[PDB]
Short mmCIF file of all heavy atoms in Angstrom, two decimals:
data_model
loop_
_atom_site.label_atom_id
_atom_site.label_comp_id
_atom_site.label_asym_id
_atom_site.label_seq_id
_atom_site.Cartn_x
_atom_site.Cartn_y
_atom_site.Cartn_z
N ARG A 4 12.55 73.81 102.62
CA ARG A 4 11.99 73.89 103.95
C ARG A 4 13.04 73.62 105.02
O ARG A 4 13.59 72.53 105.14
CB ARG A 4 10.83 72.89 104.12
CG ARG A 4 9.77 72.89 103.00
CD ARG A 4 9.01 74.21 102.85
NE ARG A 4 8.14 74.05 101.65
CZ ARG A 4 7.65 75.10 100.96
NH1 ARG A 4 7.81 76.33 101.40
NH2 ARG A 4 7.00 74.90 99.82
N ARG A 5 13.32 74.62 105.87
CA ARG A 5 14.07 74.44 107.09
C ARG A 5 13.34 73.55 108.08
O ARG A 5 13.91 72.63 108.67
CB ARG A 5 14.33 75.82 107.74
CG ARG A 5 15.05 75.78 109.10
CD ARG A 5 15.38 77.17 109.65
NE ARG A 5 15.81 76.99 111.08
CZ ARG A 5 17.06 76.79 111.48
NH1 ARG A 5 18.12 76.85 110.69
NH2 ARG A 5 17.32 76.51 112.75
N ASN A 6 12.02 73.76 108.25
CA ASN A 6 11.23 73.04 109.24
C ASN A 6 10.38 71.92 108.64
O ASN A 6 9.58 71.29 109.33
CB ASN A 6 10.36 74.03 110.06
CG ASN A 6 9.45 74.87 109.17
OD1 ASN A 6 8.74 74.36 108.30
ND2 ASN A 6 9.45 76.20 109.39
N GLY A 7 10.51 71.64 107.33
CA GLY A 7 9.72 70.62 106.64
C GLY A 7 8.32 71.05 106.26
O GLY A 7 7.53 70.25 105.76
N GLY A 8 7.97 72.32 106.49
CA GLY A 8 6.64 72.85 106.21
C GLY A 8 5.66 72.55 107.32
O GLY A 8 4.45 72.51 107.11
N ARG A 9 6.18 72.28 108.53
CA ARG A 9 5.41 71.67 109.59
C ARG A 9 6.07 71.86 110.96
O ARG A 9 7.22 72.28 111.07
CB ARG A 9 5.28 70.16 109.30
CG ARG A 9 6.62 69.41 109.36
CD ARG A 9 6.71 68.15 108.50
NE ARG A 9 5.70 67.18 109.02
CZ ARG A 9 5.81 65.87 108.84
NH1 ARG A 9 6.60 65.35 107.91
NH2 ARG A 9 5.12 65.05 109.60
N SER A 10 5.35 71.53 112.05
CA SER A 10 5.86 71.59 113.43
C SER A 10 6.69 70.38 113.79
O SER A 10 6.42 69.66 114.76
CB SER A 10 4.73 71.70 114.49
OG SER A 10 3.89 72.83 114.24
N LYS A 11 7.75 70.11 113.01
CA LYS A 11 8.53 68.88 113.05
C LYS A 11 9.23 68.61 114.39
O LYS A 11 9.23 67.49 114.90
CB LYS A 11 9.54 68.92 111.88
CG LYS A 11 10.00 67.55 111.36
CD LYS A 11 10.72 67.62 110.00
CE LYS A 11 11.15 66.25 109.45
NZ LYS A 11 11.63 66.32 108.06
N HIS A 12 9.82 69.67 114.97
CA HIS A 12 10.50 69.74 116.26
C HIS A 12 10.04 68.80 117.36
O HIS A 12 8.87 68.80 117.75
CB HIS A 12 10.41 71.18 116.81
CG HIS A 12 10.72 72.21 115.76
ND1 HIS A 12 11.98 72.72 115.53
CD2 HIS A 12 9.90 72.79 114.84
CE1 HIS A 12 11.87 73.58 114.49
NE2 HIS A 12 10.63 73.64 114.02
N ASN A 13 10.97 68.00 117.93
CA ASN A 13 10.78 67.13 119.08
C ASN A 13 9.65 66.11 118.95
O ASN A 13 9.02 65.73 119.93
CB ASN A 13 10.59 67.93 120.39
CG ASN A 13 11.82 68.80 120.62
OD1 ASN A 13 12.89 68.30 120.98
ND2 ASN A 13 11.67 70.13 120.41
N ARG A 14 9.37 65.64 117.72
CA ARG A 14 8.26 64.76 117.46
C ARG A 14 8.61 63.80 116.34
O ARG A 14 9.33 64.15 115.40
CB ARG A 14 6.99 65.53 117.02
CG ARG A 14 6.39 66.43 118.12
CD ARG A 14 5.22 67.30 117.67
NE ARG A 14 4.87 68.13 118.87
CZ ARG A 14 5.47 69.28 119.19
NH1 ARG A 14 6.24 69.95 118.35
NH2 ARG A 14 5.34 69.73 120.43
N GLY A 15 8.09 62.56 116.42
CA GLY A 15 8.20 61.59 115.33
C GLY A 15 6.95 61.61 114.51
O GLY A 15 6.83 62.33 113.51
N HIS A 16 5.95 60.81 114.92
CA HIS A 16 4.67 60.76 114.26
C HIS A 16 3.69 61.77 114.82
O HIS A 16 3.60 61.98 116.03
CB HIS A 16 4.02 59.36 114.38
CG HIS A 16 2.68 59.27 113.69
ND1 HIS A 16 2.52 59.35 112.32
CD2 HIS A 16 1.43 59.20 114.21
CE1 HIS A 16 1.19 59.31 112.08
NE2 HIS A 16 0.48 59.22 113.19
N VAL A 17 2.91 62.40 113.93
CA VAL A 17 1.77 63.22 114.27
C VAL A 17 0.70 62.85 113.26
O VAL A 17 0.99 62.69 112.07
CB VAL A 17 2.04 64.72 114.18
CG1 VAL A 17 0.77 65.54 114.45
CG2 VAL A 17 3.14 65.11 115.20
N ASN A 18 -0.55 62.63 113.70
CA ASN A 18 -1.59 62.05 112.87
C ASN A 18 -1.97 62.84 111.60
O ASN A 18 -2.06 64.07 111.62
CB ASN A 18 -2.89 61.79 113.68
CG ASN A 18 -2.60 60.79 114.79
OD1 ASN A 18 -2.02 61.12 115.83
ND2 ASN A 18 -3.02 59.52 114.59
N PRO A 19 -2.21 62.18 110.47
CA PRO A 19 -2.82 62.78 109.30
C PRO A 19 -4.29 63.07 109.48
O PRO A 19 -5.04 62.28 110.05
CB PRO A 19 -2.58 61.78 108.18
CG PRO A 19 -2.64 60.43 108.90
CD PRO A 19 -1.99 60.75 110.25
N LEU A 20 -4.72 64.21 108.95
CA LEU A 20 -6.10 64.53 108.71
C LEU A 20 -6.30 64.37 107.21
O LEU A 20 -5.35 64.23 106.45
CB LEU A 20 -6.42 65.99 109.10
CG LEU A 20 -6.18 66.33 110.59
CD1 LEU A 20 -6.41 67.83 110.84
CD2 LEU A 20 -7.08 65.50 111.52
N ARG A 21 -7.56 64.35 106.75
CA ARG A 21 -7.86 64.22 105.34
C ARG A 21 -8.52 65.49 104.83
O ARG A 21 -9.39 66.06 105.48
CB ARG A 21 -8.74 62.98 105.07
CG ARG A 21 -8.02 61.67 105.45
CD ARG A 21 -8.71 60.37 105.04
NE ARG A 21 -8.68 60.32 103.54
CZ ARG A 21 -9.40 59.48 102.79
NH1 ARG A 21 -10.01 58.42 103.28
NH2 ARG A 21 -9.47 59.71 101.48
N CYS A 22 -8.07 65.98 103.66
CA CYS A 22 -8.47 67.25 103.06
C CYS A 22 -9.97 67.42 102.89
O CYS A 22 -10.67 66.55 102.39
CB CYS A 22 -7.78 67.40 101.67
SG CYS A 22 -8.10 68.95 100.75
N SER A 23 -10.49 68.60 103.26
CA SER A 23 -11.89 68.95 103.12
C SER A 23 -12.34 68.92 101.67
O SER A 23 -13.42 68.43 101.35
CB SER A 23 -12.21 70.34 103.73
OG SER A 23 -11.95 70.37 105.14
N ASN A 24 -11.50 69.43 100.75
CA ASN A 24 -11.79 69.42 99.32
C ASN A 24 -11.86 68.03 98.70
O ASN A 24 -12.70 67.77 97.85
CB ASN A 24 -10.74 70.27 98.56
CG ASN A 24 -11.22 70.59 97.14
OD1 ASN A 24 -12.10 71.42 96.94
ND2 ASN A 24 -10.64 69.91 96.13
N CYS A 25 -10.95 67.11 99.08
CA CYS A 25 -10.77 65.91 98.27
C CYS A 25 -10.30 64.68 99.02
O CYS A 25 -10.03 63.66 98.41
CB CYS A 25 -9.72 66.19 97.18
SG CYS A 25 -8.07 66.57 97.86
N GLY A 26 -10.17 64.72 100.36
CA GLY A 26 -9.79 63.55 101.13
C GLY A 26 -8.32 63.20 101.12
O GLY A 26 -7.92 62.19 101.70
N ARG A 27 -7.45 64.01 100.50
CA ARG A 27 -6.00 63.83 100.55
C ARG A 27 -5.47 63.87 101.98
O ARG A 27 -5.67 64.84 102.71
CB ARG A 27 -5.28 64.92 99.71
CG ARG A 27 -3.75 65.01 99.88
CD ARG A 27 -2.97 63.77 99.41
NE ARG A 27 -1.69 63.77 100.18
CZ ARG A 27 -0.52 63.29 99.75
NH1 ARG A 27 -0.33 62.86 98.50
NH2 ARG A 27 0.50 63.22 100.60
N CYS A 28 -4.80 62.79 102.42
CA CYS A 28 -4.10 62.76 103.70
C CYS A 28 -2.99 63.78 103.83
O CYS A 28 -2.18 63.98 102.92
CB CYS A 28 -3.56 61.35 104.01
SG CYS A 28 -4.91 60.13 104.13
N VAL A 29 -2.91 64.45 104.98
CA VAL A 29 -1.92 65.47 105.24
C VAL A 29 -1.69 65.54 106.75
O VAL A 29 -2.67 65.55 107.50
CB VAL A 29 -2.29 66.84 104.65
CG1 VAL A 29 -3.66 67.35 105.14
CG2 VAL A 29 -1.17 67.87 104.92
N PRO A 30 -0.47 65.52 107.28
CA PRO A 30 -0.20 65.67 108.71
C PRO A 30 -0.84 66.89 109.35
O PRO A 30 -0.80 67.95 108.74
CB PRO A 30 1.33 65.71 108.77
CG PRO A 30 1.80 64.91 107.57
CD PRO A 30 0.75 65.25 106.51
N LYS A 31 -1.44 66.80 110.57
CA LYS A 31 -2.09 67.93 111.24
C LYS A 31 -1.14 69.11 111.46
O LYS A 31 -1.52 70.28 111.35
CB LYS A 31 -2.73 67.53 112.60
CG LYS A 31 -3.48 68.69 113.30
CD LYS A 31 -4.21 68.34 114.62
CE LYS A 31 -4.79 69.59 115.32
NZ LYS A 31 -5.46 69.29 116.60
N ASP A 32 0.13 68.83 111.73
CA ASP A 32 1.23 69.76 111.77
C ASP A 32 1.51 70.45 110.43
O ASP A 32 1.80 71.64 110.37
CB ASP A 32 2.48 69.04 112.34
CG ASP A 32 2.82 67.74 111.63
OD1 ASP A 32 1.95 66.83 111.62
OD2 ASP A 32 3.95 67.60 111.09
N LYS A 33 1.42 69.71 109.31
CA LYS A 33 1.61 70.25 107.98
C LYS A 33 0.41 71.03 107.44
O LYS A 33 0.57 72.12 106.88
CB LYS A 33 1.99 69.12 107.00
CG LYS A 33 2.40 69.64 105.62
CD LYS A 33 3.13 68.61 104.73
CE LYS A 33 4.52 68.23 105.28
NZ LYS A 33 5.33 67.52 104.26
N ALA A 34 -0.80 70.46 107.58
CA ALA A 34 -2.10 70.95 107.11
C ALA A 34 -2.38 72.46 107.06
O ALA A 34 -2.04 73.23 107.96
CB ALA A 34 -3.22 70.24 107.89
N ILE A 35 -3.07 72.92 106.00
CA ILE A 35 -3.45 74.31 105.85
C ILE A 35 -4.84 74.49 106.42
O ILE A 35 -5.83 74.02 105.86
CB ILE A 35 -3.38 74.77 104.40
CG1 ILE A 35 -1.97 74.50 103.83
CG2 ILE A 35 -3.74 76.27 104.32
CD1 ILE A 35 -1.84 74.73 102.33
N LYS A 36 -4.94 75.16 107.58
CA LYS A 36 -6.17 75.31 108.34
C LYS A 36 -6.79 76.70 108.20
O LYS A 36 -6.12 77.72 108.36
CB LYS A 36 -5.86 74.98 109.83
CG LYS A 36 -5.53 73.48 110.01
CD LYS A 36 -4.74 73.14 111.29
CE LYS A 36 -3.28 73.62 111.26
NZ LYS A 36 -2.46 72.90 112.26
N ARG A 37 -8.10 76.78 107.87
CA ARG A 37 -8.88 78.02 107.86
C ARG A 37 -10.13 77.88 108.72
O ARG A 37 -10.97 77.01 108.48
CB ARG A 37 -9.25 78.55 106.44
CG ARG A 37 -8.15 79.42 105.79
CD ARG A 37 -7.02 78.65 105.11
NE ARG A 37 -5.96 79.64 104.72
CZ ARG A 37 -4.82 79.84 105.40
NH1 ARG A 37 -4.58 79.31 106.59
NH2 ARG A 37 -3.85 80.57 104.86
N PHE A 38 -10.26 78.70 109.79
CA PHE A 38 -11.35 78.62 110.76
C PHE A 38 -12.75 78.75 110.16
O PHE A 38 -13.66 77.99 110.49
CB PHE A 38 -11.25 79.77 111.81
CG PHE A 38 -9.99 79.86 112.63
CD1 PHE A 38 -9.73 81.07 113.29
CD2 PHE A 38 -9.09 78.79 112.81
CE1 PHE A 38 -8.60 81.23 114.10
CE2 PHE A 38 -7.95 78.95 113.61
CZ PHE A 38 -7.71 80.16 114.27
N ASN A 39 -12.93 79.72 109.24
CA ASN A 39 -14.19 80.07 108.61
C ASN A 39 -15.38 80.24 109.55
O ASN A 39 -16.29 79.41 109.60
CB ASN A 39 -14.53 79.17 107.40
CG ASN A 39 -15.62 79.81 106.54
OD1 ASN A 39 -15.44 80.90 105.99
ND2 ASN A 39 -16.79 79.15 106.44
N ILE A 40 -15.42 81.36 110.30
CA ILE A 40 -16.62 81.73 111.01
C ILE A 40 -17.42 82.58 110.05
O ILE A 40 -16.96 83.62 109.56
CB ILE A 40 -16.34 82.50 112.29
CG1 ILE A 40 -15.35 81.72 113.18
CG2 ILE A 40 -17.69 82.76 113.01
CD1 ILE A 40 -14.88 82.52 114.41
N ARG A 41 -18.62 82.11 109.70
CA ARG A 41 -19.41 82.65 108.61
C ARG A 41 -20.85 82.65 109.04
O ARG A 41 -21.25 81.83 109.85
CB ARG A 41 -19.18 81.78 107.35
CG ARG A 41 -19.71 82.34 106.01
CD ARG A 41 -18.96 83.57 105.50
NE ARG A 41 -19.53 83.90 104.15
CZ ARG A 41 -19.08 84.89 103.36
NH1 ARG A 41 -18.11 85.71 103.75
NH2 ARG A 41 -19.62 85.07 102.16
N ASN A 42 -21.71 83.57 108.57
CA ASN A 42 -23.14 83.38 108.72
C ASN A 42 -23.72 82.82 107.43
O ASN A 42 -23.26 83.14 106.34
CB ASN A 42 -23.88 84.67 109.09
CG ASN A 42 -23.41 85.12 110.46
OD1 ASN A 42 -22.60 86.04 110.60
ND2 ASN A 42 -23.94 84.47 111.52
N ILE A 43 -24.75 81.97 107.54
CA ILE A 43 -25.47 81.43 106.38
C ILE A 43 -26.16 82.53 105.58
O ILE A 43 -26.22 82.51 104.34
CB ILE A 43 -26.45 80.33 106.79
CG1 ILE A 43 -27.21 79.69 105.60
CG2 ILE A 43 -27.46 80.81 107.86
CD1 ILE A 43 -26.30 79.02 104.55
N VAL A 44 -26.69 83.55 106.27
CA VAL A 44 -27.40 84.66 105.69
C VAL A 44 -26.60 85.52 104.70
O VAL A 44 -25.43 85.84 104.88
CB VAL A 44 -28.06 85.55 106.74
CG1 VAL A 44 -28.92 84.67 107.67
CG2 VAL A 44 -27.03 86.35 107.55
N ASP A 45 -27.29 85.93 103.62
CA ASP A 45 -26.94 87.06 102.79
C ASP A 45 -27.42 88.33 103.49
O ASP A 45 -28.05 88.29 104.55
CB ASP A 45 -27.60 86.87 101.39
CG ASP A 45 -27.06 87.77 100.29
OD1 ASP A 45 -26.17 88.63 100.54
OD2 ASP A 45 -27.53 87.61 99.13
N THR A 46 -27.16 89.51 102.94
CA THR A 46 -27.46 90.79 103.57
C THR A 46 -28.95 91.06 103.44
O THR A 46 -29.66 91.37 104.40
CB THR A 46 -26.70 91.95 102.93
OG1 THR A 46 -25.30 91.71 103.00
CG2 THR A 46 -26.96 93.26 103.69
N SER A 47 -29.48 90.85 102.22
CA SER A 47 -30.91 90.91 101.94
C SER A 47 -31.69 89.84 102.68
O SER A 47 -32.73 90.11 103.27
CB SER A 47 -31.17 90.72 100.43
OG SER A 47 -30.54 89.53 99.94
N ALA A 48 -31.17 88.60 102.73
CA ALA A 48 -31.72 87.53 103.53
C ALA A 48 -31.76 87.85 105.02
O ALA A 48 -32.78 87.66 105.67
CB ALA A 48 -30.92 86.23 103.31
N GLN A 49 -30.68 88.41 105.60
CA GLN A 49 -30.65 88.85 106.98
C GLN A 49 -31.69 89.92 107.29
O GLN A 49 -32.37 89.87 108.31
CB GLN A 49 -29.23 89.38 107.30
CG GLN A 49 -28.96 89.66 108.80
CD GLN A 49 -27.50 90.05 109.03
OE1 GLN A 49 -26.72 89.34 109.66
NE2 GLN A 49 -27.10 91.23 108.49
N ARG A 50 -31.88 90.89 106.37
CA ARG A 50 -32.99 91.83 106.44
C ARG A 50 -34.37 91.16 106.42
O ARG A 50 -35.24 91.45 107.25
CB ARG A 50 -32.91 92.85 105.27
CG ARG A 50 -33.89 94.04 105.38
CD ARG A 50 -34.57 94.43 104.06
NE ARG A 50 -35.62 93.39 103.77
CZ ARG A 50 -36.89 93.45 104.18
NH1 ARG A 50 -37.39 94.48 104.85
NH2 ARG A 50 -37.72 92.44 103.93
N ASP A 51 -34.60 90.19 105.50
CA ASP A 51 -35.85 89.46 105.39
C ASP A 51 -36.14 88.61 106.62
O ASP A 51 -37.27 88.56 107.09
CB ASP A 51 -35.88 88.52 104.14
CG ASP A 51 -36.02 89.29 102.85
OD1 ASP A 51 -36.86 90.23 102.80
OD2 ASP A 51 -35.35 88.96 101.84
#
């Protein structure tokens, strides 16, 4: 890693978040983020 896998630049500490899957601590700068805009409905359910 050139950048440490993260937004390391001009910063010392940046807060850890804890993993959605398992609670593993990970820096917010390092963290793998997925927005997930989803509907609850299935296609048949949306029809119903």
Side-chain angles (χ1 to χ4, degrees):
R4 311 297 175 201
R5 176 176 169 91
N6 57 49
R9 66 207 297 204
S10 304
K11 206 166 182 171
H12 314 269
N13 301 287
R14 294 174 183 85
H16 181 67
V17 176
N18 299 77
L20 299 175
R21 297 189 67 194
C22 182
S23 297
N24 195 74
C25 63
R27 169 65 205 211
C28 298
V29 56
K31 183 176 174 182
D32 52 301
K33 188 164 293 194
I35 305 171
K36 292 159 289 199
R37 274 82 188 102
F38 301 163
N39 196 62
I40 306 173
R41 191 68 175 183
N42 295 102
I43 182 61
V44 308
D45 195 357
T46 302
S47 53
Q49 190 174 247
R50 191 222 74 90
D51 287 317

